[PDB]
Amino acid sequence: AEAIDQRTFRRVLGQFCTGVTIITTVHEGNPVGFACQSFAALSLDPPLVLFCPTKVSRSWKAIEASGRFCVNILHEKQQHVSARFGSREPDKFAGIDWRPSDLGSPIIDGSLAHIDCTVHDVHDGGDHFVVFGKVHGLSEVPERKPRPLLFYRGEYTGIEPEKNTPAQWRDDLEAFLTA
Amino acid sequence: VTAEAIDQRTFRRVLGQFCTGVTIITTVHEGNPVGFACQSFAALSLDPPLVLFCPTKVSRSWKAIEASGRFCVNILHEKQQHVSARFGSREPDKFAGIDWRPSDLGSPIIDGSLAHIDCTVHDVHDGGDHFVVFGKVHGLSEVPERKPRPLLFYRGEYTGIEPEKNTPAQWRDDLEAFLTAT
């Protein structure tokens, strides 16, 4: 009954659709990363983001040690990259083109956007941590078609661009960070 | 030394490249239903079962949620763009013309939503010009069943999925698996 309760959490929370990130660092010379969907924009002033690694994550411990990370937001053509980071295969950056950011963290070629960060604060979050990052630089790749990789009810998907609709807002007290 | 190095227009443009669902987060306070639209939501923990959301420090709804001690998260269907629009307006009664009923804890469920999650306030942290609020999950539901077509927000616009793109996914590394992985 414990395992069924956990299956229900996974299914119901899966109804909230998200993009997909790879969060990366370099620790003593080698590139390190993990796939993550528990990402959000947090604050404009100061500029902050958050992400939620598991308490058992090996990749987060490398980020904690360096104090630096880059967030790569994935394009739908990068489904293979996400699958690679999700596996137990060694040498995860093999065959994947990348370059260091201004702070030294891996930027993956072909992404929609990247965000160059330092670790700002860390909190306990049950069986996960919540990590705040301070933003030091960011950009989107020009002329790449805006088609994000999605994750919804346990499967990869993408958008139908014919559905794109302008949004108007008036309540300034509750403004989205991205409007 | 106080540093200002990030342009605000650039922040909004770049962070909009991360696509999200759309929620309405609700409570009852001083005999009235209260709610707001929010994209800063995430699944947080399995054991214990937790979620998080991030209201602005100036939020009217957060003051009501803080006082009552409880909230319900409603995940919207693509045909509910009109609900998100009303909650994003300055109308004095936002629940007018929108069908709703109380959850087991006593917070508004929006009829026609894809799913809802019934919570109590668990902890609260400072997050710059926002707060980060943790909720303890007491109930959750994805019925009555509706065709699985979520309302999305991407690059400052509403959108939706192409269901022909839906593809199964496998995850061998248990130490890093998503909370919602099958």
Author numbering:
A (entry chain A): 3 to 181
B (entry chain B): 1 to 182
Can I see the authors' text?
MthNTA-MoB consists of 11 β-strands and five α-helices, with seven antiparallel β-sheet core regions forming a split-barrel motif capped by an α-helix. Consistent with observations from size-exclusion chromatography, the biological molecule observed within the crystal lattice is a dimer and the crystal structure contained two noncrystallographically related dimers. PISA calculated a total buried surface area of 8610 Å2 and a change in solvent free energy of −234 kJ mol−1 upon dimerization. In the MthNTA-MoB structure the loop region has the highest deviation from the structure of substrate-bound BtPheA2. This region adopts the same conformation in all four protomers in the asymmetric unit and is flexible and adjacent to the NADH-binding cleft. The density was sufficient to allow modelling of the long loop at the C-terminus, a region that is often absent in structures obtained using crystallo­graphic data owing to a high degree of flexibility, and may provide additional insight into its role in modulating activity via access for cofactor binding.
Nitrilotriacetate monooxygenase (NTA-Mo) is an oxidoreductase and a member of the family of two-component monooxygenases which initiates the oxidation of NTA under aerobic conditions. This enzyme is comprised of two parts: component A (NTA-MoA), which has monooxygenase activity and is responsible for the oxidative conversion of NTA to iminodiacetate (IDA) and glyoxylate, and component B (NTA-MoB), a flavin reductase which consumes NADH to reduce FMN to FMNH2, which is a required cofactor in the oxidization step. The amino-acid alignment and the three-dimensional structure motif of NTA-MoB from M. thermoresistibile (MthNTA-MoB) associate it with a family of short-chain flavin reductases.
